[PDB]
Amino acid sequence: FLHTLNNVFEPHVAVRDAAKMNIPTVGIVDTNCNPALITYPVPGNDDSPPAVRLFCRLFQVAISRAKEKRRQVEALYRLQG
Amino acid sequence: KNRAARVRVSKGDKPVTYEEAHAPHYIAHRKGWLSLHTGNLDGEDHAAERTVEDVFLRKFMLGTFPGCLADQLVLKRRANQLEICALVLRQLPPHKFYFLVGYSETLLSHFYKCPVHLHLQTVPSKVVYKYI
């Protein structure tokens, strides 16, 4: 969740329902959010543009890096035999 | 509420033939006529005779082929011969079907004093138009 709230300022439904579904949840919890049901919360500012752009970029890079590492280790496993 | 020749809505499980799913106001619009004969045309005669004949045929056929009749009969009358056409469930062995074909055609031919043809179309289970 890049914002844990919905435009009416209650918690986004998906939080309660992801919990309900046994799905782990990362989310950026601003100062007025409720972190409780969120698996790995990262406290910080969700409202300002450089912040959201930052968090987007980070999660992007992490994902891309992982998918790469998986490709490379797969290749290695293919040459192993 | 008009009730005539209607099949009311059930809980939504009810199998309904193409015929039964169309209320009388749809005749000649969507579904067609279960009989055909000259009698009801403008300048023509003996409508009454053919109506009674019709009624007896539906009853007779329904009793002669118990349980195996799929949909209501189709009665085509052409130049003094009647072709009856029926939708039949497969129940009986073809022995019983041919026995009843021959028996019927002869019986009715001698009853109504005209050549009678019988045409059976066979079907696995009642064709289902709606719900189900």
Added chain:
Amino acid sequence: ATPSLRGRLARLGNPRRPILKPNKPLILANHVGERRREKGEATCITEMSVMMACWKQNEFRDEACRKEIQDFFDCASRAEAARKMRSIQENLGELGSLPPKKLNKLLHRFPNKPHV
């Protein structure tokens, strides 16, 4: 400035005696009310009375006073035109404020939190 709410309502903690007994709880609602349509009153009554005096005096011959008849007519026309044309513009333009629909939407975009 809003009137003070401190000490006013009857509560387990409050030392003194109630000042307000609110009929229904004081919690800002998420919508406003709908504007009350204006009570009508008779129109043209003055011009009518003037014409009626003119008649009572001149013994109800219409030829005698053409001015007050014509002016009562003119006025009734201005009251018809008023009834027709004022309805729409009083129903849209609130002047400095917004139509209650827009207010309600605006208030649902930033609602009150009684809960949590």
Added chain:
Amino acid sequence: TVDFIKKQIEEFNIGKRHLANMMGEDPETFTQEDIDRAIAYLFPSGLFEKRARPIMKHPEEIFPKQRAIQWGEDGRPFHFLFYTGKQSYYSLMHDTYGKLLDVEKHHNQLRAKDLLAEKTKILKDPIGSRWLIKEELEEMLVEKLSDQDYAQFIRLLERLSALPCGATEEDFVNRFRRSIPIQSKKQLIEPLQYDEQGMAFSRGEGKRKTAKAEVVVYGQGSGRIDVNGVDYLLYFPVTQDREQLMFPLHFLDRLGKHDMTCAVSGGGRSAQAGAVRLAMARALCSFVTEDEVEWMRQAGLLTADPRVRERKKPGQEGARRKFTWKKR
């Protein structure tokens, strides 16, 4: 349901071959147009509803469009918006908004370079251009939509077109264009006619309320009118009907200049006057200028009068009038 479609196409082709054979035609030059005549002749169903009659058609037209499979065999959904529940619509919104941003960027660079080189393509009005209906859009995404959805999208396209239009942008918004067909109410002028050394006669046919009227007018004659072989003062004793006959001529100031013969049948006297009125009006359009035709139409001279007797209804008295209703 893909195997179905494949099979159905196989058997539609085999069948189209068969049909072309019995109808005795070349299997190659057989069209849908021909298939139709062939069935209509082979299985002749009178039924008033055209959708209930026998049909052999290409299964793509018969069957409704299908949402394709949304994910691979591993479970990963193909399109990144899948979980929105409407991928089709929100993609459209995504790319539309993207093109809007693009336009804004490019046009801002061109604002800083002192260039407004674009034009407003937003007026297609002579082409009779309109937006898609909701139905059309719904058919283009193969997905159900909501009224507020359609509204949102259209509003966005509007935002787009209201800016400087790029080439790919113009092309983009123009998928969502349709053109409303011809709008002209101008009549179809009867070609004037010259018969047996006689010059300039025109024809017209009115119909009003159980009365039919055929009127032939000669431009070369003096003023008189012969209805069913007799004079119009004799056939139409009532002033009102003579005035009705007078209306179109007096309107065009042709009142002395034309000579007419009429055949009118059915209806009463007033209905016949009305019929001849309309027919005369329609006949005089050959002799007059194209502008005065528009005038006659705008006087309501050229329109048939649709008002006709309503059918009496069972359980009432008069087609409107009800039997007396007793409260208690």
Added chain:
Amino acid sequence: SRYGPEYKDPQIDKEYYRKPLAEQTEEEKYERDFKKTQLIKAAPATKTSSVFEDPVISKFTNMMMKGGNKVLARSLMTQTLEAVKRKQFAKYHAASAEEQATIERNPYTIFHQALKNCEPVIGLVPILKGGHFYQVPVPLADRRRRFLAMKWMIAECREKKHRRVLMPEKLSQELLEAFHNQGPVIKRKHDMHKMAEANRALAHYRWW
């Protein structure tokens, strides 16, 4: 309503279409009329391009008509106009040059003027308040007033004549008497006006 709301009423006036070139806003207006691809209701049988037809005379004709008889009501109107005409031609030749300058012989202008004089200024509507029905002075629309005039004319010259007496006779009489303001119709108008002054206080009960 065999016409959809799409269909506009026709404009029968010939003068309007004949002389367009001097008016800008009206050129624009009827441009928008036809070019809108606008549908037009077919011009009614009653209404004509005739230079001779007075819409007021036609209305009156209609309000006189019983059953379906236009022929009979148009007869009675025609006869009445002719009767007023000849009554004034009688009053003209038995008079002197002064009164020959004064007296009106156009039956049309007489009809119109006699209706203008007979139309009420003010009117009465019943209003329920506190379980009582008060009669209250109400200003009237134009159409309502013209209607009241015509209807009062016809009601009187139907009702109060002696059975021997024909309609165009009695009607021409009352037209001429209402021309000069001494007719019983006019007395009715005054009864209304007086009932409206008697109740003038109650003018407050009217909320519109």
Added chain:
RNA sequence: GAACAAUAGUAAGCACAAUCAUAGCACAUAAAAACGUUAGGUCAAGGUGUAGCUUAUGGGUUGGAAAGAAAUGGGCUACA
């Protein structure tokens, strides 16, 4: 169990809607109108559950069914 600058709802089905009819459109009219409500109406259309009759509550023949103190509904013809 809604909020569209959207806050928990998706829903097939039946109705409405659309189409069909009234011989071209359109409009109108016709038709259509679910689930239920009124133990609404009809065992005398026919068929039937339960309960009743069987030299009779069944089957036939012949002849009779009147009538206006009064009250009233809907119409027709009028009063010109």
Added chain:
RNA sequence: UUCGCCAGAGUACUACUCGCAACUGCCUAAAACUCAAAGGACUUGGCGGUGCUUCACAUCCACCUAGAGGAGCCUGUUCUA
């Protein structure tokens, strides 16, 4: 931490007691008997001679036209028969 109160509903702010400047009073306060409930809060309906908006298109008021209710007949009810 205390104190005052409360053991179904009625019967009952009653009957009897004691006390009281109260004498149609206040206070204190039962039982026979009767019942299988009596109560508290809510929910969905329905309803409201409750308020606020919006309407009615032959439709309530305002208004238009033709009729019924009075007569003779025609035909159906109710009674009486």
Added chain:
RNA sequence: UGCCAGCCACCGCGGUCAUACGAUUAACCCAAAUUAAUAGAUCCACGGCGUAAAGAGUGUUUAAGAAAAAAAAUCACAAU
């Protein structure tokens, strides 16, 4: 049988298709006993008192109790 005759500890049953009455058939359960009636045993609150029964119209003291660790008596306004 038909709101009758009757039945029931409590809820209730009987108005023509009564597993509830009365009798029959089958069953169940106790058993030299089995039901009914009456008395016991048991059973109320270490719970409660805004709306259900219940904070006594007010304050002071008496009797009796608690003190269980840290401080306090006191200033615009319509007490009497």
